[PDB]
Subunit: 311 residues, 4 copies
């Protein structure tokens, strides 16, 4: 059992505070936005009206968790570090690029503060089922953080054991993993999202082929397929069953033609392709998934006009 300060009280920050506390830890929360801080006080969680009070309320060695917008992080660290102390641990659990972690961890180390990066997967489902956690930073900090990660993670019961897993040690089976030195956590999280784009694109394209199976040799394209039912049937016994398939089946059940649904993207997909390119790794599928999101917003438009022009 530990005391954890949380800065950044959006949905994720607030949900992680709820899970941590429900798991027996003590939380102090802070946010530039007083209504946000006050929402959590209404739930019995200690607040703080400034970064000075927040640091005052946390006993040394401190553990500070950040769930703020990426572009807010450096300013956050600047405002706070002068009240922090050697042996403190600061964790950035947000959507920061791993090269920023490497620089940040360096600056904090110059003041005896250990900076830990955490890539978080699970979104709104994490509250009850736990979050998948990809952790970068110094071993000592990460080991001291163990009780926090155990509460946050799903625990081994979240899935059948992999045959032979008893041959290995570490925490991989619990749903959280120390991936490496500073940055490694966000680096693995980035690629996670890149892969996620690819998986979604593969289902999407495939179902689009089914959706057009009535295009009608028109005689070979006169199928009126039931996509809701087809995705449902794939959940059992097929090679392509997955959480993403489960979600597709749910949506399609509600709305067989998705008529109440332009796809945005948040960065990790983009950063994944950039890392592929730096490393010289072929990334056709991951990049095309990304580009499909761009074109879905009409960013292909000017290329299309030139095509019409030439022709």
């Amino acid at each position: 059992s530990m005391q954890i300060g949380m800065i950044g009280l959006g949905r994720m920050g607030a949900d992680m505070v709820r899970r941590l506390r429900k798991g027996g830890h003590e939380c102090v929360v802070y946010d530039l936005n007083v209504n946000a801080v006050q929402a959590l006080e209404r739930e019995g969680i200690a607040g703080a009206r400034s970064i000075e009070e927040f640091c005052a309320k946390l006993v040394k060695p401190r553990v500070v968790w950040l769930m703020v917008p990426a572009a807010v992080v450096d300013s956050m660290l600047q405002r706070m570090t002068p009240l922090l102390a050697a042996n403190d641990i600061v964790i950035d659990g947000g959507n920061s690029h791993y090269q920023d972690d490497i620089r940040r961890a360096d600056q904090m180390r110059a003041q005896g503060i250990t900076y830990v990066d955490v890539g978080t997967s699970g979104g709104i489902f994490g509250l009850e089922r736990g979050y998948c956690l990809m952790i970068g930073g110094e071993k000592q900090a990460v080991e001291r953080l163990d009780p926090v990660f155990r509460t946050l993670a799903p625990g081994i019961g979240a899935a059948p054991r992999t045959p032979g897993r008893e041959k290995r040690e570490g925490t991989a089976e619990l749903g959280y993993l120390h991936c490496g030195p500073s940055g490694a956590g966000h680096f693995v999280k980035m690629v996670h999202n890149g892969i996620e784009y690819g998986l979604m694109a593969a289902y999407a394209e495939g179902l689009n082929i089914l959706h057009h199976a009535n295009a009608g040799n028109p005689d070979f394209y006169r199928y009126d397929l039931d996509l809701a039912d087809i995705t449902e049937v794939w959940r059992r016994g097929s090679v392509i069953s997955s959480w993403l398939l489960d979600l597709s089946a749910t949506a399609l059940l509600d709305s067989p033609d998705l008529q109440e649904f332009r796809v945005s993207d948040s960065g990790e997909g983009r950063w994944t392709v950039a890392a592929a390119i730096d490393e010289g790794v072929p990334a056709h599928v991951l990049s095309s998934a990304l580009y499909e999101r761009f074109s879905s917003r009409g960013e292909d438009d000017f290329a299309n006009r030139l095509l019409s022009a030439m022709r």
Copy 2:
């Protein structure tokens, strides 16, 4: 409870018979390869030494399941159809292209025989876990076949129910589905395989990026000095991440067994190609399905000539 004849006694055919039997049905089997029939006979399943005895042993109306190579199907139909009778049902459960089911179904119907296409997924795991079944053909025949599909399929218990399914009926929740008229089962199974290629390619490419995270051209080598444990990472993704799936479970198992996969050219069996062909005909964008297929092609060196041409152009300019 039913009598089912099974032709084609390779791993898949043998396994469905074992599952069929174990689930209370009566099977008679046959294969051009006698060693194969005998092996099932040793298991105490009724055999047959010729197409003739096979048809003879099946009481009318017959139910005949084919698990032969795609290339052997038409000649299996030429050979046995003269012994079959109106109201018999023939099922092709192998990897046939749906356009062939359409033609075949028409031929057989002219003889009062109902031709049913089944795309089956699940492979070696189907014996114990049930096969996902995608079924095309006439409604009457598919309804007659319901007990065989129920036995073969996983059953609702195999996965938690989709919020709202109590609002719907049909068999989808059991792991089998009548997809449409003739060809529809193989059409849907084809796309399932195309999707499967795309899914495997996404994992593979991403894991390849992680694998190269120690690459440290290269502007900041310090940004690429991670020695990542791919076995652990795939394991950790199985709980709480957006990308858990059966394919991940398999990747984790393979990487646990071989962290460098050093004992391992990727083949492709056709359904991936057929899927892209359907996409092209339909005017459906298929970047990722196609690219996953093409990666298999280049993995066999089929890009070699394009590559030499690029090197040569470079030499030229």
Copy 3:
């Protein structure tokens, strides 16, 4: 100097007749649409008001060129073949799929008629500049046709000679080529079009990147504040760069005329699809040809359903 009958009097057919005539050949033309024949008759080219008079007017052995829609070809052959004679030659110069040339060539040969496929490139520019011609079919017929191809093609003068060509003969340097037996001309023209899609997509995507260079997510907006002049840039690339080409010349002309292309959904006519189908059958990786095709599909919104599904998944998780 030869007599050539031409059926199909759209822009392309009319232009080849004009070029043919202007180059000293005798043309007789015909089209199901009388207004079209008359228009050429006004130009003082011999017409015909029926398939019958058409064949009647052509001295045996005949040379008959088709420039009709692909979909009209077989019925044009059914209709006129009973009036034709052994040792006649029929040329299909339109956009037929090569597998159809193979079948058609076989049918016609059974009547002593030689069927020749010509893939023609160059479009509206062919009249003054000559058409690139890719020719499939029997050697004897193609040799008999040499004077017609010479007239139709650009001639060696149209581009500087490739260092070493004096080491080789044949007609390639003239802008026409006997590519192989029946279907080979259309096979090669098909891939030419596939390549053309890839080339246009490369320019378009790159110009789109330049077009967005003022985008200033976005880590350093100062790194994207270029307002680039795409008309000037394409113009400057025409001299001294690695990427000058006819397609660039066209891009430059379009952008000069319309820097924002504001008066401009991309269609595709089939050869691009057929090219990817050939690639798939052959096991050839085709990432860029396919992606250029798929971009045309999504430009028509055919991705819409895949997109809604992604939005919905996002909503779900």
Copy 4:
């Protein structure tokens, strides 16, 4: 007529000095490598044995052209700037990324020195036919540089005029172009190369389909095509005629099976895709061209083994 210092005497640097001088300009050359400097002295071109002498020999306002490896540029500028003077112009004609130009131009401006970026196209052919030039930087510098660019560029005679080009002014028709402020030159050069990859990939894939047209319904794939002849025929009257096609036809003439030819890549292709991703522009074709080069070196290998594994 002007005096131009050249630093970096590889093939391009040396070739540009030959073209400049053949065009009436005066050149002083320098290189860390004395044999390189001496090769050019053997041809009657003034050398310099150090960066101090080089700067000494150049009359103010100076014009310094750099053709050094990208990774050498900043060190070059550091060693040299203390001997330079306000009103001097420094040009980086090499393969530098445009964001470096923006930073560099800033630092040089703080000392009254104008920094010009030039993207050069044409390689070994530029000596005789002139180089295509994409120029970024301050208008005043670029205008003062005009006589140098005119000598280097092909001149309008290199190609038929675009109908209506008389409606516009500027130098685009001469083969060189002021593209914008600092970086714009290298930015346009980068995308040039990205496009080049795409064009080469399109021909390569297409010819590979022809090459496999004898794969044999095997009856539909029994064509033995003559690729040398086919590329030759496409040079006249087709839609796809191009310099790149001209080069393909030459190579194939020599070696119909390319048996005496793993494809490397130099960076601009990579940087092009990164810019696409930052801008949210779909880049399927350009990226796949790049990834084909990566896989041609076997970088796909580990992904392929995993595919075999799962299956």
